Amino acid sequence: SPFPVTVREHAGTFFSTTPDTTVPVYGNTISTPFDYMCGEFTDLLSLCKIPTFLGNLDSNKKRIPYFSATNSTPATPLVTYQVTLSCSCMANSMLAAVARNFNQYRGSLNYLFVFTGSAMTKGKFLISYTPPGAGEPKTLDQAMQATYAIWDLGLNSSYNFTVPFISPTHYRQTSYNTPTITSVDGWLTVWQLTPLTYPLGVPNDSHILTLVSGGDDFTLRMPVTFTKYVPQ
């Protein structure tokens, strides 16, 4: 006998994200074999963990993947990155590209610096991560007051720096209209501890490549669409 039904108030609604399937109109079809394929990946997080380039400003306001250092120790940071997957300096990194499609993140961030100066050039940098609450660090004295690591140049070329996940909330927003205590998390600044030092016949300016990616315990969640723009 026919079954009595109660048609819910949302009849005919198309839910773009319902966790259910629809009617197959061309079934019993074999998906062209691809067992020979390589390079498959199943988690978008894999991408977030690949270090990609940060865009630093040129003296002509042009974007470049590195910053300059020379035989002196400025009283101000060589570069300053606000920790937000929204930071304009990392806008084109794979990390940011993926994060733009998720609502929240949690976990470590890895800032990779690669020294590209000559083999005869030496020097030390102090990479600092300052949590918010008291503003951006104004001096080396202040920057050292927070989380930091001293990077000494030598045989090994790069330094893998981790911005620890320090937050009042378990998850943080990947973007925002106005900065809030849940979407902006401090600054990463790199200072010149000792001047870059070298012998004669060596260019005065050394270039340090800068990259970012999610760390070991980094995660993203809540698939969303980012503010659209016109490519150019």
Binding site: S1, P2, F3, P4
Partner: peptide
């Protein structure tokens, strides 16, 4: 005759059909 549904009737048999009873 003319009933060919495999799942049992939703309404009980007492209600779906009149109840047949013998007076003897």
């Amino acid at each position: 005759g003319n009933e060919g549904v495999i799942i049992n009737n939703y309404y009980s048999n007492q209600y779906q059909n009149s109840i047949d009873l013998s007076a003897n």
